[model samples]
Target chain A: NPPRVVGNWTPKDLSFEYKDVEITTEDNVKLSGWWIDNGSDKTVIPLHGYTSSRWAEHYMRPVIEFLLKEGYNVLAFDFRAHGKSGGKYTTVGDKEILDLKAGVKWLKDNYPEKSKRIGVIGFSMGALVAIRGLSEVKEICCGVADSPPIYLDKTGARGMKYFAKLPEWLYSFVKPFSVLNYTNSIKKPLFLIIGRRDTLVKVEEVQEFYERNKHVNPNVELWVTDAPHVRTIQVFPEEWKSRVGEFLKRWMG
Target chain B: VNPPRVVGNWTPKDLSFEYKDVEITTEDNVKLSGWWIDNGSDKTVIPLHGYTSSRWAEHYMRPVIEFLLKEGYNVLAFDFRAHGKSGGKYTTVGDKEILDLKAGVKWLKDNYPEKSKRIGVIGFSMGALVAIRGLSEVKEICCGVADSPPIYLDKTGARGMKYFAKLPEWLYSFVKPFSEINVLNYTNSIKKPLFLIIGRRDTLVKVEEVQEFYERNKHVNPNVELWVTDAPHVRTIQVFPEEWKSRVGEFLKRWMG
Candidate 1:
């Protein structure tokens, strides 16, 4: 079973949002995501974390509210295998980037004006997707990430330490369909915001990614907050909102 | 259980190769592949492909050979299950990719070198992970060149909005822990010239993490070189010879020598 929509968000509250738009990847896999366009001329795509929904940012209601308040349209959706999308197995980051393409497609078809000044903001898995997506699409003008899980060196380390899940037997079974190592090629203004003490997604990995991405984008910015993976809204809601809000204002809005 | 196979192989003097049936991904075995080696020097690196492609599906190997050959190195190229002449019912891409790497290693050890012939590997997309798996555990590969290695977990987390909603919820339960696994921390165990080239315009693999990997491993081997190029993942070969030949040839030469 897939996850379902949690809130009864009205159109006025959502800014021309659509649910269950199917998307196909380069490998012919099908995926789904939602759209929410706040009446602003600029568009912002919001991606969720692992084991979460498009509403993952609902926790960061402040940021969403701020984006809407700042006159930036936002689109937040789920990846294919995690929330309300299709498919039975997760390809990790390999195939999820398709969802980002799908979100962009939705924006291109539905909201032309917002597509002009499109920006992507993600949390966790979504953050990595947006970064990966920006590499391929010119529709995105800027991006903001919070607690992205991109650990290249320790690809199999801390996630399930000591015991490797699904034998090398199984690891070998699922090794060929990944697309997670190309996030840095995107040459847009990107803002990366990570919590200093995220455990599920390590701070070391985040810091390493930040340092590696330092010279990639001339307009890139980094923010190391005291928030947790999904708890930036829970802990530093006000600061999180302001930080992202100001970025949208300057870059996209 | 892992698949069993016959060891002895003869290079028909003709350039083409052969493959036999093997059991792995699918319930039944229906895959096979063979390689052609161009040995200008004593050292070589095997080549593997990604999902939905055979060893000959794309033009990655030809370019790699040109680079290695120019640098006076030999090269090997083969296919994985459900691709080329390999046998397998289904293709999970990553899992089978690892086996593909192992098979390439087996071929190199059994046929090419009676003595310790220097060996390395290069993988594209899904094949990158396969090559890494062999280099990480199999004890013989002296170095590896992983181009556009596909990481499932990073894709799931990075491309969240696009992928999560398209997959069923049970997927999270099934693939949750596996996605958390890390290869970057351990590939250092191989301690050889592991050259990783990433693309800034690649929508598939996240470049940020690939750089993290290069940084971590450089601490130990110092032979590691990470280049964040302006190309996409699969298309890194467009101008690869000029861009990668010098850097990669230099690294492999330093290590194999």
Candidate 2:
């Protein structure tokens, strides 16, 4: 419930440049975190991808800058496996939703007024977590899904197949530990973007995934990023940046 | 499965009679079936909607139909239930998928083959059900996309509302018991090759199902449908029915024929 991100008993780490906090989930999973805060009326809860950290990848940073540029505060953190956060295993978006909720709880306590305009931005696995996070904590204004996992079992296998360059056999071993099937029941403005020739996820699968649930509300809007994997901004920086700005401007108000 | 469509089965049982150039999603959660008359191609391909709406629900259909009809084939697209202009209860189906496929199969076999050069299809979600069904029952589609489906998820409604609230749960549950996973599996069991694509970030279908479906069915064609991934289709070329059909045509000429 602290007003500022710093000033906690957990001392800061010089290399990380992020404030640390321990977020407790509904299921009581103790997830550690690396966070950044900007004092403003608008807030964004960012969830990083699996095995990634709060150093904030190139994709995550620009978005943070955009939030700040638009006079909104931003909160970007690492899930269990990525960055400065604690937790050995990651559940894709399933368990991460809990982490997002914990972050929201902190926001509610310290930044209640700003909490109403809260939004989420997730990349890869984080996108899945964002969907779950938005559902678990209904205060989310909207969310932006960047290269999300659209298919279930098959998409995971394809990802593993591409990562390991091994056969489908490898996916069987990892699929069990992958906490997928995270759901999003909230009705919020959604923005999704994906690549076409992505070896990890199929275009049609992602389309189907978005299409299936997108009708949750009429305000949902989705887009396709022509580059591979998580390179939408990298490939089309201007458009990506501008679109994010326009969306935030339109919805954040 | 079930051969071609019979007179009572395939013919439009409920047409407006006026053929009032209207665009709509199926009322019972189905996709809208868009129609246009052209002298260019004899063959046809129908695009179905994903779970959110019927065929006519989204704005992408008009361009798709126009593009395909211009490219030569007589193009058609429709909704499942609560979508464009289809009938049924909530539109959940392994059977409805087959029915969607059967609807097109019968129409092509009974009416349009003489004017058609080649026929194929592209589908999303429930639309995928029809594509797989078309693969099994319809003999002409050279290329089609299965996109993403919860093949392993047990109950359709359970999977649909896995994260939604009790209200969605109530509605999804009402249709759950009747919804089956084999809608895709049944269609995958067919002999034709399809363009199976998936999202890398998809939670419902997961990476495992895509790989398994592909591995098990790789023997069917040069390139088949069913994909695994974490990405979602958010307005990419995969959903464009015209482009999808042409790609299938290319695949067909390269592999099937």
Candidate 3:
């Protein structure tokens, strides 16, 4: 069964005024998101993980707010089949790239002046989409991937722990095709944050990707912490703010 | 992945196939429980189950056994040590499981000489890795089909420990060296006809890793063929039964003939 669409917990909750926007993917899936125009030349798009919306309780709120406080326009959207978005199935990282592509295109179309210096921040599946999506969407100058699983096959198995109802064969069917093969296609800097104790995406796998990408993209920096999964921001908010803020400042600013 | 070790108690009598219960002793002197189904055919297929499974693991090997039996081929399905009715306290994945497969192949050769000449082997998951490793040493295995076999033992074991079993990393790392399930070291030595099946969506064994293995070793053994599908793990039969039957059946016929 697909995840039910949760409430539209908007900028009103944070006492911020933002335009409610709708973007459509190439496949005609309409995605719902919020566009916070801070009247800045650079923009940062925030993406959420699997089965989660843009307004995810843990980090999505503060992360977006932090980017805004840092004086960058924020474009946060729910990937298809999550939040207020419309879709039947979540193809993990495979199809989510389309949604990101649409989001990037929306930013470029609506805010042509600021979109030229667009960056992205994503967690887990969102991080995977952001990293992989950067190669597809030229508008995205740089991105931050937090606890992204380089290999979907391995991560799909780990995901079964959370999504137990998923069919046993779903992961295997998706593994061969769901690859972050676009790492070399990335033109700008990428910051990969991971936790050593994270069970979903192992530190060793992330280190492997980081080592490989550092050669391709010289601006690639990996921060391995003792935190777990997407809790890197929660565990070390200051560090997350400094590193992610600095990286976004370097590229987007 | 810590599947059910026991398959309840069911025998050949309960199934449609005409079979006989057999026992074989490993090189390490561990007695293994198995069943031999003879259809009076010269071709025989020795089916091996994956981790934490047995010969009578109906969900795992029964479908393959039934398919082979229907095709009039002899099938020998066995329980790896520490699983099923086999006698052992532990399983070393591919390492010790290879000996169990060797003993089964030897038994087929000594007793059923006619079927032994065209003996084929097919294994699922861990058993697939073991079959590949075992084939390097056992020349009697004329052909083999390995479904979703992990090439690297340490990497695969670490993943299995974290994801499938949810076991601690330290425990897996400590026990990994003793397992010695690395199949790539020995796959090149195998001269037999080999077919590797992988699911595109397989999350258990990374598809990219398996594709890399095929790309690297396809030249070493020209007789080997790698099949990729939208299936998961060893569930190729469920997803693409006709294709699975046609490819496997055709491969066996070509080599076993």
Candidate 4:
């Protein structure tokens, strides 16, 4: 079920200048997002985790505010099947890439000037989609992926185990795969963020992803902390800004 | 957006499935409109839809009905009170919806003994919640398949009303408590075998809620089976159509055949 978004407060409540935006995917699914415009040339799209909305309080708000304060125009949207978006199912990051592409297209079509200097900041499943999607959208200059799952099958299996007590055969029977197979297309600078204590996505998994994909991009960086899964931005704000912000500033400039 | 209140308007003639338009009156006197696809089979299944929905919704019921008919089972799909062509002014989610189902079961038993003697139920979301409560109360129901049912109405209605109806929190909080329908209240009474299907990505009804409900009721009904799919709410049939048909069709046959 989509989280009821009406009646709930948004960035407008915080006195920030934001516009409610909708991006329709190629599949005809309508996605909802907020474009926090600061009238800056530098634009960053902030993506939320799985089953989360753009208004995701803990992880997203902190990142959005930091980008806004830094004078970077920000666009945060709910992936289809989450929040006010229109879809019956979420294929995790598999089908979510369409959502990111549509959002990027919206920025490019509506704000061509800012779209030219676009960067992306994604967390968890959001990070996974951004990494794969930016490779497809040439307008994106750079990206900062925080706590993305390395392998979709492992993540899907883990979700099943954590959620239900079922037969072991069921776990083995259902296999979901959406790996970052197109890292070579991502020629732009990319930053990776991970939490050491993340139980959902272990440090080793991301470390392996970095080792395998780092060669594709000339300017790739990785930063690990004691915080757990997508909690780095919230748990350690200063470091997140210095690392994620510095990466985007250098590439976008 | 909240799921649409209305879905596809389909007919048995379109699919050439033999069916008759039937109506039943609940204990509360609410008139329920339904379609009875008589396949002249001993096994019968009554299909139920979610809240703010109707049996005419093709995306949800069409596949299930088509599958049941092909498997040689009579299918009775209906619109609960306040939905589709049914007669009512309001919906209480599962609380009063149960009476509608009871009437449907009674209709099948009285009119189609060959099919009704071994009756089963298949319901989704709010309809699943109703079936769990309503079927448990009816001793004649041999087995049931409940997909993505909310364990309690108050929690779901409060969370859903604000989301779907856009009602204010205070108002939703004030009204939902008294209307709460708890499935556990009737789970203890259901001796019939049950098949529970949960979608991992169903944000409306959490997987944890289904886990809790299953845990509490599995001991009471030892023949219960639970299946968690890598899909979303009510989309399991779409994602795994063949698997859903084979598994559910086999389960019903084991108990009702």
Candidate 5:
């Protein structure tokens, strides 16, 4: 009824040099983004939240700046059907991981030297996609997810009920592609950040996921950084910058 | 507890039919359990059950295998792997179920050649998918009856858990990798006469899918028949047993006669 993503806030606020880029997914869906390349061998692909733009607030503003300041090359892209990407439906967890795949492929092909050590940082629904993709995507060395939904099918259904203004019955279409059926298949280090009082995704659920798979995912850690969804960097800037910097330094070092 | 838990512990001897408990080995080397009821007839019909459903549990309340058994033209009811009294740990839904079906049909033809000269199949839900796919793979199968088949396996398997199994629907995702990818359009390649059934108010599988599948099959083969009911997908026989008998009887009698 109101607005899904307010685009008035953008990367223009930051005085960093970033070029506009277009990416194609495995399914041939075109995506819009800004690749903030610092000419570093280790790069981070930071994804926006559900139906939010690559240039939207939260992860776009602070996460992108922090990753760039941390010296990791930044690949900023909007998920399909959001921002300027070419897709009709917002699949939530379905094809979104593949969207990240395309962004990574784009970096690897264009900037082969900087693409060797790639890390992904995603917020909200994008976080879930990143965690799932961490297990599958070979190029990704590690991941940092802020407030990811663990029980994804139900989360997507409730997401549809409120965000899309569509019926929950529509979840059947995306059921097969559901992410965060969270697995022990994760061999890479995953850093999950959740809020103590986030309404969208429960901290306990994310904690439970970390506890369940941390044995298989030895490097996986849960960081209850702040007060609400995607608010870790905004609410606690100094620690987020320091801790995330430490993670990127060690894992992608 | 997984399936092999027999809901229909009753035997064919309970129905006063002479039957043999048979074992079949598939080309994949997996062994299966089956029941052979020889009515000394020329035509043979094999009834394959859905996922987590065995030959016994599938015949519990529905006219699924019972319909073929009652019609009395040499019926064979077999269990798919991970199902009642069968081998394997998981079900690949339609993919491996086709191997089980091929084995059942082959077993019937080899042992009872005169009775199994013409083979017809009736499958419900996931089993319906196996029947649809098996129509192409198995040369001995002449035609099929697909009741409440889904257009997509992910939707149907996920929804089936909640509607039929009464657990969380997403629990299906754990075993999802075992399933064959979508075989809904495979009906187009097979020119066999198919009897497609759908329920308007079914909670799990969407009626729109089976309807679309029916439309395509009708265009391919003139003998393809469709029956849509106001009842739930798997409960058509229980809701309207007499009409189900009348309609199902007409198709088989018309073709297999």
Candidate 6:
């Protein structure tokens, strides 16, 4: 049980042709999503964070449109327990790993010819999960995590402390479930985006994880933005689209 | 089986020192019952118990609490959620317990502000995880001691889930995503003085798990100390009571000064 936000926007709202898709995860959990095929062999997956859906007006929609406009097929899906996905509880990103794998598998299995190179992009919870997914899912060539909570406990505590110094206990209930620290295995190209003033995941923490990852995988890249949580795209739409689109294209070959 | 609610049987009547019942309300409003052993000392030590053990379980926890009282420091011992007389129906291992501990520390600071200006924590196993997590996050705490903390999630969690919780180790896969206690992550944030007590013969958390934690943490935290005891789980005091008292007491005195 977690906080949920219902979306009122869709791909139709963006004047794009999309197909409703249902992806079944390894745990047998059903996820609701939309597939936008630009008839390109390379595809980009947009993974949204907790409490938000694939049609999340704030970030997911803009990201999907950016990919589609850049001549890449977009597979945008709602994480289990968010949107219309069938699930009773949210494991944050632990089991969401399976949900992400299922999304990539669905594309490759149904349209093998059109899914030779697959890249992933996620925000908040999904971002960190996508980073972890890049290590486990061999099919995903590259990925991007925009404002992922590198340390869940620290992020939860920091987020709560700002909501008026409300001691860390308020958000620590969600701490144990976040098993992060899988960056030691990723050998592929990955990009990390951090916000200097983000209250949830501190910029320094992401830098710490980035430095450790860079040492392991030379392809790891980072961008420190002045914007707040999930607001980089909103603040610099053109730059955000260009930077992310370029990163995916350069690595997903 | 999904709800991990296990409680122990014990109370403050088994103590020789002066203690009084305390009801602490966390920010989440979960009421926790504990004992505040006041010895008119300016320093206070919060003794946290392991997963199944309560505030009063004698095997390894009670002796340490009494030692703190004997050393002329106030002691705060409380049962976590789903254990002893505390609220909540389940235990998110050491995750949600951070709240219970923060609330306890706040309750003491607010009630005895002058006497508790200097506070420290000594926790075992599940409590040790919370101790390290709290010591790094909470600014009110001056120092901490984590005894046999399960820092490695899969390594220690699978062992705990199999033997103690009476569940298959594989069952942890489904529950794995929800509970992550990485002592390695907490170690970097440990700017304050910390003493890590690991067991050589420990079975639940294993020896190497905590060893790896100390290996990385030692480089970052200069105010930290590590002592590997040839004992098992919270038995450092039992194996060498005098040395344990001297080391822990000296640590609190030096840092909480």
Chain B TM per candidate, please? 0.72, 0.65, 0.88, 0.88, 0.87, 0.87
Candidate 4 stretches greater than 4 Å from native: A1-7, A87-89, A165-178, B1-25, B28-257
How high is the DockQ of candidate 2? 0.01
Summarize candidate 4's per-residue lDDT along A1-253 as a digit string, tens digits.
4233332667777668888888899999999888877888878989887756777666787888888878898888888888788888888788888988888889888987766688888998899977886687777888889988887678666655442332111211121211656565667788888887775777888887777677777787788898867878777889888877778778999
**Interface C-alpha root-mean-square deviation, candidates in order:** 11.5, 16.3, 11.2, 15.5, 11.7, 13.9
Model 2 chain A: ten consecutive residues of lowest lDDT: A1-10
Predicted candidate 5 versus true structure: per-residue lDDT over A163-222, tens digit per residue: 232112223223333333465788798888988756567787888888888777789888
Report the error of model 6 at residue B44, Å: 42
Worst 10 residues of 4 chain B by lDDT: B163-172
> What DockQ, between 0 and 1, does each candidate earn?
0.02, 0.01, 0.01, 0.02, 0.02, 0.01
Q: What residue pairs clash in candidate 5, if any at all?
A: none
Clashes of 2: 91
True contacts kept of each: 0.00, 0.00, 0.00, 0.00, 0.00, 0.00
Residues A17-102 of candidate 1: C-alpha lDDT, one tens digit per residue:
54455666555656655455566677777777655665543453455666666766667655666655666766555677777777
* Candidate 3 lDDT over residue span A71-93, tens digit each: 88888888887888878778877
TM-score of chain A of each: 0.77, 0.79, 0.89, 0.89, 0.86, 0.91
Candidate 5: misplaced stretches above 4 Å? A1-253, B1-7, B58-62, B162-180
Worst 10 residues of 3 chain A by lDDT: A169-178
lDDT of each: 0.62, 0.56, 0.77, 0.76, 0.74, 0.78
Tens-place lDDT per residue, model 5, B1-257, is 13223446677777677889889998888888878888778999887776555676533233555667678678888778877787766667677778888888888878899999889888777788888888767889888888877678777756654322212212222223223275756757878878888888777678888877778767777777788898776667767778887887777887776
Best by lDDT: 6
lDDT of 3 by residue, B1-257 (tens): 22335655776666666678889898889999888888888888988887766776556577787788877788888889888788887777777788898889888888888876677889898889877876677887888899988777677655554433324332222223223245666656877778889998776787877777777677678888889899877888877888898999999889888
lDDT by residue (tens digit), candidate 2, B120-217: 67666556656776676666666566666446646433444333322212122222222324644553466666767666655445556656666667
Q: Looking at candidate 5, what is the lDDT of residue A36?
A: 77
Error of 3 at A55 (Å): 1.4
A137, model 6: CA deviation in Å? 0.2
Report the TM-score for the A-chain of model 1. 0.77
By lDDT, highest first, what's the ranking?
Answer: 6, 3, 4, 5, 1, 2
Question: Cα lDDT for residue B211, model 6?
Answer: 78
